[PDB]
């Protein structure tokens, strides 16, 4: 989580830097528009329900998926459904990896590769 939270921090800060011109999106730079887009995606991702706690593995998977840009091809809506579907899939078929992340909390090349493989397997061949 320490390795992963930096992208969330910087994305939210960059989105915060342009609060005034949110209502003037017509007159803005394209790069500023992309920063607005990513900030909106992160802000939508940050939502959660009640009496539904997350283990560290779920947060790790969601944050890693957000950081590398896998969430940039969906609309602002359906983000919560995408997150829930991905988490359910990962818990449904990737039990050993989830247990290892929950009980240890380590981060190395093998763990990152396995997480990326699972996320890319979800990206296709599945529905929201």
């Amino acid at each position: 989580i320490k390795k992963l939270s930096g992208g969330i921090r910087t994305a939210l800060a960059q989105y915060r830097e342009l609060a005034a011109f949110a209502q003037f999106a017509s007159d803005l730079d394209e790069a500023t528009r992309k920063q607005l887009e990513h900030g909106q995606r992160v802000t939508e991702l940050m939502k959660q329900k009640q009496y539904a706690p997350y283990s560290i593995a779920d947060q790790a998977v969601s944050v890693y998926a957000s950081n590398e840009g896998y969430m940039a091809d969906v609309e602002v809506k359906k983000i919560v459904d995408f997150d829930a579907a991905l988490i359910a899939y990962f818990r449904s078929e990737y039990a050993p990896l989830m247990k290892q992340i929950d009980e240890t909390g380590d981060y190395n090349k093998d763990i990152e590769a396995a997480i990326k493989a699972g996320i890319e397997s979800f990206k296709a061949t599945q529905t929201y």
Binding site: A20, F21, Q23, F24, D27
Partner: protein, 69 residues
């Protein structure tokens, strides 16, 4: 041309002190480009930042008019 009136129409015309006029017209081009850029900058700076800054925060005061603390 005719004996009583003389008129010549030209699409582009200017006093031909030389066989070329690009070196003279480029000054007008620079003036026009500079005026356009400065006008855009002035409009943006005067309106977009200032009006939004004024409209940024007004309700936190209106909502507390009847407060007695």
């Amino acid at each position: 041309v005719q004996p009583h009136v003389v008129t010549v129409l030209a699409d582009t015309a200017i006093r031909a002190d030389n066989l070329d006029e690009a070196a003279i017209l480029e000054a007008r081009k620079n003036a026009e480009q500079l005026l356009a850029n400065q006008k855009s900058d002035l409009d943006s700076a005067a309106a977009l930042a200032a009006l939004a800054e004024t409209a940024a925060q007004l309700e936190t005061i209106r909502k507390i008019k009847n407060r007695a603390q």
